[PDB]
Amino acid sequence: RPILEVPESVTGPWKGDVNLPCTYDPLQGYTQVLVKWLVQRGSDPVTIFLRDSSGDHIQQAKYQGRLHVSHKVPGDVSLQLSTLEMDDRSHYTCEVTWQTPDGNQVVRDKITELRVQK
């Protein structure tokens, strides 16, 4: 522990919306300090979204205006994508970093496959 709960795959309709769940159980002493969502480009995961103490940032231009990440409750950092494009099909990684009181960081990630259905 902690571990992320993310489904193996999700579907969304072309030009519609989809949610990519990413949830976890908050743990005493584990302060969430970073969230990233990444898209897989071959061997390399590429950040598309970052949340840190400065707020939320979309990191790849093709997702501008189309990406939100849940922030109402601790432990839910699910990603919402809108106006889905066929080229949004990909493996996506949810990645969360926590810091404990001693300054150690703990990182967890988990993958889903998004399939965009015409």
Add this chain to the structure above:
Amino acid sequence: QVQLVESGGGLVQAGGSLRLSCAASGRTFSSYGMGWFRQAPGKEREFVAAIGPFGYETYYADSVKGRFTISRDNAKNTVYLQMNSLKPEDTAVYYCAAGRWNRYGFEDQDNFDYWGQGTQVTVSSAAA
């Protein structure tokens, strides 16, 4: 439906080697990370090695680095552990496991959703 089936354990002499195999069936595991763990009787299970889903990314416990090699053939959904330069303290039940981590958390047993049944490895100072 899903099972991870291990094989290849047995008795070897120190300095010898074994190949463990973990055949995963019931679904495609090409985009899963795979791991090996080991446990001695009455002791905690501990990390041995892992291989990520993407690229060519392998990870090892310090105690096995340079001696053990994890590898996979995705066309057969099988992960291997080549255990070279074996030592008596490598004696344990070895388990494979599969999960959907990418780069992180591969030593956290909670992060693997499917586990094999275990196979016994015994390393003796004597022959055979």
